[PDB]
Amino acid sequence: AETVSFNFNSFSEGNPAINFQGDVTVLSNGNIQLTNLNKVNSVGRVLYAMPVRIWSSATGNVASFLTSFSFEMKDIKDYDPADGIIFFIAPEDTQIPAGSIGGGTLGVSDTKGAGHFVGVEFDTYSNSEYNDPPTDHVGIDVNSVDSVKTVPWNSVSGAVVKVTVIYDSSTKTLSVAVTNDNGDITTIAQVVDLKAKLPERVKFGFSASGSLGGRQIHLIRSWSFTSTLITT
Amino acid sequence: AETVSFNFNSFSEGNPAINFQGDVTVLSNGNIQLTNLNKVNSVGRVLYAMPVRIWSSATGNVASFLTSFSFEMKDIKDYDPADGIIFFIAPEDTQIPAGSIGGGTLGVSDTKGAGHFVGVEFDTYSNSEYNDPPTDHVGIDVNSVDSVKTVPWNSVSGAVVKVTVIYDSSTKTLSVAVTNDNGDITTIAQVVDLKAKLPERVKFGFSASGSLGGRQIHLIRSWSFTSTLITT
Amino acid sequence: AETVSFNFNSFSEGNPAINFQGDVTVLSNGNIQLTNLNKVNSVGRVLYAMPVRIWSSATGNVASFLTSFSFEMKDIKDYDPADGIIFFIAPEDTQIPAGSIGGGTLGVSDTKGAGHFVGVEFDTYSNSEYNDPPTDHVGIDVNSVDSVKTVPWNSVSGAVVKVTVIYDSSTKTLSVAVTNDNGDITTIAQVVDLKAKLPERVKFGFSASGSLGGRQIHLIRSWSFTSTLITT
Amino acid sequence: AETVSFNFNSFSEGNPAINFQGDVTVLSNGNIQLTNLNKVNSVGRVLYAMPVRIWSSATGNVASFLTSFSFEMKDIKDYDPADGIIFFIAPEDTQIPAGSIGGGTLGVSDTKGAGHFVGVEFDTYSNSEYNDPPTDHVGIDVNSVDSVKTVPWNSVSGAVVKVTVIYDSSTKTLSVAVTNDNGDITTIAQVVDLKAKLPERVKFGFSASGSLGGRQIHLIRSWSFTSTLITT
């Protein structure tokens, strides 16, 4: 079988394993800061630099994967704590959408909320234009920030959040478990056919965005990943 | 919300927080050894001593859970490496079945392979009587060791195995990710209606068994768990 | 710290983690076959597709690494069993030298035996033009196939050879252990300043070559690697 | 050539291939436990029972060797996680020093830290009396626990650690690569003249020790070794 495995306990500028897009910076403590607090419609994205073959046109086989990551969102004075982080999967040539308005688009979609990606969003602002639920939520996104499904959640300022994601290729189930600061767990699961929605080779990463009035600290602290594709 | 959370980096004999059943022993290194290598049809089980409320009869709500554990199976001289470990969920009064034949029953079922439990087995012997697949496998069990579903796997002697399990109450999906020594991940997922198959309060744990000719080292090294049931 | 880690138990075409150069093919059994048995001066190379940051101009720190691989060389009818395999490190833009004569160059050097690389060669033909010792040998190469140091060895046709390599950044020592089919171990070690001989970002891989009359099967069976660079 | 080769996937107290010294026990799971958790100044050692000829007074030739082993150190409640494991080489008549104080001596030296051995220590306590560095460290020891050289390391409780050691007789270099649970590799290398420091025939093994208030689980899980001495 074909396996891709990596583990980041910290990050650094110049690490050839990570592609930096937009307003991303690496802090002295090793954290990734995705948005620029002084910029309007800020968008910052980080990608694992190696394309991952998630499915094969030869065998028809689809990879399974296990990934865990930790993030933090922190309020800043005066601005609205917005807009959130998305863990996403996209074609290997993925770039911040041209003319990105940031905000509710989470840096992966156009103004209408459409794009080419599969993601798990940690959304902290209700965008009526994208049919967002009225509170903070975890969403499963398929080519749109108008989530296929959401679950109520709560983004706690300065709290370290742990996430575990399992993609089971046979059932095509994307399962998500979010461990909050107060100890409670939040889960969401959705059948997503990665072979039907994505190309054979993709990139995995994180994206975050803000607007003129909606800005907050968006940090990626750690990330581990393992994918295995049966080669038969 | 109502949350049950715990973490075991090690185990100990004088700990009332764990129920020890049958042939289970705690080694000086802190590992749980489930079966007795010198006994015929050995069966040993461990349970978290506090019952977990997985569903409310008042609200009809079902808990989601996230659990991770690590184990080891090791071959022993002159015996068939058998029978395997099962991570299981059962009624609070669960005990080793009366007159247990061990072996293929994995210590949770009768001779016909029936019982009252939901489990994830790591099965290292092919029992034709329970319609086992021909190789080592991971299986999702519902009141039977004749698995609802299996996936081929490989039990590596002396290798430390890591498992992550997510139960998403809304989709009723039980997702499992198994991290092998060679780095590959094995996944299996199945819709299991925990509210329909189990009582309000349940016990979580591990069981393993052997027979006259089938014996191996079955170790539980660590276990973390979090369940959250919405109380509104 | 910054760590690159991977493990290949087998290989496959289309794996974006591997760069294929020249006459390389992947066999149905998962082995990499480096040279083309029907081509004159055949040269094939495989590289880990992600550049590795072996040192940083900012801190002056140099990475340490541990790598293990297994190979096989097998005689073919009529042709001379030649020329061998080289495990090498080179600048990230590395390509088969333009107008490569293959042969004793091992696919990493020019006709004079010069190049920009550090390698460990498993040499099966004595090239007087490169001051080769009179028998099969393991050599340590620094920008030349005229080895800095060699040790007598024996390439057994159809034998699976295991290699372990340690690079200790503090002493700048490149240590090599080769486990022969007859059970004996062969070692060779040399101080090589990777910071002085190579750029900050490099590629690791294998190369093999043949000539008109010198051809043999060159197989790469498995490869594991871990490098760690201390960061500011 | 003269070659000694062996491989232990498990160990037993009833096998003549190993010598057991002091407080060493073999667990039913097959692991070697070097120290007794309930004893003051506990010392336990194991040795490969056959003496290995590492050098020749006839030819002056010195053997090369490749060895790999895996261990685990685990914290115990109320005791300082101390003192560590040492992989050592010593005269064939080697015994635990008479009146051993355990602790910082790692079971191989006297109170002043002196002894007759060459070793690789995995030290988890800073003994100012032996000029220990302030954190956990891997050290190369020549007749003293006041290491010739050390490298910062981190002993993770309950983590399985993998070690590879290459001794190259021509350069007299002892190279060590340690693979941690967080994925990073730690290396240390030192020129050590075995002919000058040790007799022709030596014993290879492991030792660990504790004190009154410094105790932890010290386990040896597996060990493979190959040495080759040129007899021509």
Ligand SMILES: O=C(NCc1cn([C@H]2CO[C@H]3[C@@H]2OC[C@@H]3n2cc(CNC(=O)[C@H](O)[C@@H](O)C(=O)N[C@@H]3O[C@H](CO)[C@H](O)[C@H](O)[C@H]3O)nn2)nn1)[C@H](O)[C@@H](O)C(=O)N[C@@H]1O[C@H](CO)[C@H](O)[C@H](O)[C@H]1O
């Ligand atoms: O004066 C009067 N009315 C006041 C008024 C307001 N205005 C205007 C002036 O200008 C404002 C304002 O209205 C809208 C306009 N504007 C401009 C903009 C532009 N930016 C924007 O829209 C945002 O920036 C947008 O980009 C955005 O929200 N991004 C999101 O930000 C998020 C973070 O927050 C996330 O990041 C997201 O992802 C991202 O999408 N946003 N808003 N003009 N007049 C009347 O007299 C009144 O007093 C009155 O009637 N009294 C009494 O009434 C009685 C009723 O019975 C009786 O009649 C009485 O007789 C009568 O006396």
Ligand SMILES: O=C(NCc1cn([C@H]2CO[C@H]3[C@@H]2OC[C@@H]3n2cc(CNC(=O)[C@H](O)[C@@H](O)C(=O)N[C@@H]3O[C@H](CO)[C@H](O)[C@H](O)[C@H]3O)nn2)nn1)[C@H](O)[C@@H](O)C(=O)N[C@@H]1O[C@H](CO)[C@H](O)[C@H](O)[C@H]1O
């Ligand atoms: O494969 C195996 N065995 C095969 C086997 C044999 N059998 C047969 C054997 O025989 C039984 C049975 O099938 C039915 C049969 N029988 C025979 C009878 C007939 N008598 C009766 O009923 C009569 O009535 C009789 O009693 C009688 O006549 N008196 C009456 O007494 C009265 C007194 O008052 C009056 O006098 C009356 O007049 C008088 O009639 N009734 N029943 N079935 N399977 C291994 O063992 C198996 O364990 C194994 O492989 N282990 C595995 O190992 C693995 C590791 O390698 C893993 O660990 C696995 O997990 C683990 O599974």
Ligand SMILES: O=C(NCc1cn([C@H]2CO[C@H]3[C@@H]2OC[C@@H]3n2cc(CNC(=O)[C@H](O)[C@@H](O)C(=O)N[C@@H]3O[C@H](CO)[C@H](O)[C@H](O)[C@H]3O)nn2)nn1)[C@H](O)[C@@H](O)C(=O)N[C@@H]1O[C@H](CO)[C@H](O)[C@H](O)[C@H]1O
């Ligand atoms: O160089 C190359 N190609 C060209 C070439 C030509 N030749 C030479 C060699 O030899 C021939 C020929 O040119 C002419 C020469 N000859 C032959 C003879 C014959 N005498 C006769 O016939 C006489 O008669 C003689 O026999 C005689 O006198 N008897 C006695 O005479 C008495 C008389 O009284 C009595 O009668 C006695 O009884 C009787 O015994 N006289 N002269 N050699 N190489 C290679 O391809 C090169 O590219 C190469 O190596 N690549 C490497 O390839 C490797 C794999 O291999 C690796 O892959 C490497 O990395 C790669 O670099």
Ligand SMILES: O=C(NCc1cn([C@H]2CO[C@H]3[C@@H]2OC[C@@H]3n2cc(CNC(=O)[C@H](O)[C@@H](O)C(=O)N[C@@H]3O[C@H](CO)[C@H](O)[C@H](O)[C@H]3O)nn2)nn1)[C@H](O)[C@@H](O)C(=O)N[C@@H]1O[C@H](CO)[C@H](O)[C@H](O)[C@H]1O
């Ligand atoms: O060290 C240990 N144990 C022993 C010990 C002793 N101490 C204490 C106890 O004692 C000392 C000292 O600290 C200070 C204290 N002191 C001494 C004094 C002297 N009094 C005085 O001076 C007074 O004056 C007194 O004498 C007095 O009042 N008279 C009158 O004084 C008058 C003066 O005018 C007139 O003279 C009168 O005539 C006369 O009657 N005043 N204060 N600390 N530790 C550890 O266990 C050790 O083994 C250890 O760490 N192991 C390590 O463990 C690790 C795991 O953690 C790893 O496993 C390692 O590998 C392992 O190595």
Ligand SMILES: [Ca+2]
């Ligand atoms: Ca939103």
Ligand SMILES: [Ca+2]
């Ligand atoms: Ca079975």
Ligand SMILES: [Ca+2]
């Ligand atoms: Ca050559």
Ligand SMILES: [Ca+2]
């Ligand atoms: Ca010490």
Ligand SMILES: [Mn+2]
């Ligand atoms: Mn949303």
Ligand SMILES: [Mn+2]
């Ligand atoms: Mn089964």
Ligand SMILES: [Mn+2]
């Ligand atoms: Mn050579």
Ligand SMILES: [Mn+2]
């Ligand atoms: Mn020390």
